[PDB]
């Protein structure tokens, strides 16, 4: 029995802030194709990618949530802005992140101000990849600084389609100043990119995206976007950024746990590694009893498998397994490395417990 979706197309993310951003993500993903974790599909605003499985993990415990997700979308209101406690813990666990400055349609909205605060108050290195076109009631879209094009989302579709257009005349200089910043941000990813940047004064879109992705993954920068969920202008582009810049399960370090001799060991994101998983939320249900949400880090688990609860030091047997989608449940038979699902009816599993292969015991938490 083989893997159906390559592990590189998974994005385990948290949306940290939230309810409006998440509801819009479920809406866009749904028509294009609180629950502890919801699986959605996204192939890009222009269907420019293969289908990616985006597992959206509900975020507030906090230290546990950050190990369950691989990357995060940290959402800041355009008017208030800067979270500080969460950001610091994220730094400790080296969680790659991007930033979404939402509510750009509201009074007092100022994208660059929020960005300057992330740099100054949070000690981060934010790099905008967009510029808002207007603010408050004048907010009508964004500028994709990499393509150097304005995104005009259709109003009747609810932003389900858009058209690329030219950067309006009064924004050209501002758009160029910030594109220069992002390019130099990309140039510092390698010796080769810097040498080209210095000689030619430019980099290709593919070079810029690869570089910005690498710097996001090594926690050197945080890319910044903006928009408005209510005006259906922006979250569609956040979803593209998740694919382009946030990590897959093989882009983060192997999870660490403790073995039977109290020594630190790791479990690599590979289906051939011994099975290991963390139970991160247990939800009750009036028809199926309990839903034990697990993040699988390594190996595979199937319905009928005997596994070991390393905390309780007892065997559990997996029965039914489900993944929650926005509008239904998919009943499944296996859960592989890098994925999230819920096991129905486990007997004695508590939140934070590790489930693993009996012959390679490990406690993740």
Curated annotation (Swiss-Prot):
Localization terms from the record: Cytoplasm
Source taxon at top rank: Bacteria
Domain tr-type G: 8-250
Keywords assigned by UniProt, alphabetized: Cytoplasm, Elongation factor, GTP-binding, Nucleotide-binding, Protein biosynthesis
Role summary: Catalyzes the GTP-dependent ribosomal translocation step during translation elongation. During this step, the ribosome changes from the pre-translocational (PRE) to the post-translocational (POST) state as the newly formed A-site-bound peptidyl-tRNA and P-site-bound deacylated tRNA move to the P and E sites, respectively. Catalyzes the coordinated movement of the two tRNA molecules, the mRNA and conformational changes in the ribosome.
Record family assignment: Belongs to the TRAFAC class translation factor GTPase superfamily. Classic translation factor GTPase family. EF-G/EF-2 subfamily.
Protein name according to UniProt: Elongation factor G
Organism of derivation: Vibrio vulnificus (strain CMCP6)
Residues of the full protein shown: 1 to 405 of 699
């Amino acid at each position: 029995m083989a893997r159906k979706t390559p592990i590189e197309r998974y994005r385990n993310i948290g949306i940290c802030a939230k309810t409006t951003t998440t509801e819009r993500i479920l809406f866009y993903t749904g028509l294009s194709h609180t629950s502890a974790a919801t699986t959605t599909f996204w192939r890009g605003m222009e269907a420019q990618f293969q289908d990616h499985r985006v597992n959206i993990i509900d975020t507030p415990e906090v230290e546990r949530s950050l190990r369950v997700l691989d990357g995060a979308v940290v959402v800041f209101c355009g008017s208030s802005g800067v979270s500080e406690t969460v950001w610091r813990q994220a730094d400790k666990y080296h969680v790659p992140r991007m930033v979404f400055v939402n509510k750009m349609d509201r009074a007092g909205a100022d994208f660059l101000r929020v960005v300057d605060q992330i740099k100054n108050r949070l000690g981060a290195n934010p790099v905008p990849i967009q510029l808002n076109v207007g603010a408050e009631e004048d907010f009508k879209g964004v500028i994709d600084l990499i393509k150097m094009k304005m995104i005009n989302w259709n109003e009747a579709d609810q932003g389900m389609t858009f058209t690329y257009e030219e950067i309006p005349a009064d924004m050209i200089e501002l758009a160029e100043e910030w594109r220069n910043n992002l390019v130099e941000a990309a140039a510092e990813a390698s010796e080769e990119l810097m040498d080209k940047y210095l000689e030619e004064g430019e980099l290709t879109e593919a070079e810029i995206k690869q570089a910005l992705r690498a710097r996001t993954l090594n926690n050197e920068i945080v890319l910044a976007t903006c928009g408005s969920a209510f005006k259906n202008k922006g979250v569609q582009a956040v979803l593209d950024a998740v694919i382009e810049y946030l990590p897959s399960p093989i882009d983060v370090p192997a999870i660490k746990g403790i073995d039977e001799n109290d020594n630190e060991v790791e479990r690599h994101a590979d289906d051939n590694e011994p099975f290991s998983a963390l139970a991160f939320k247990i939800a009750t249900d009036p028809f199926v009893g309990t839903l034990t949400f697990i993040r699988v880090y390594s190996g595979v688990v199937n319905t009928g498998d005997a596994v070991y609860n390393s905390v309780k030091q007892k065997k559990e047997r997996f029965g039914r397994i489900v993944q929650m989608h926005a509008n239904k449940r998919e009943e499944i038979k296996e859960v592989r490395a890098g994925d999230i699902a819920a096991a129905i009816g486990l007997k004695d599993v508590t939140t934070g417990d590790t489930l693993c292969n009996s012959d390679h015991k490990v406690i993740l938490e």
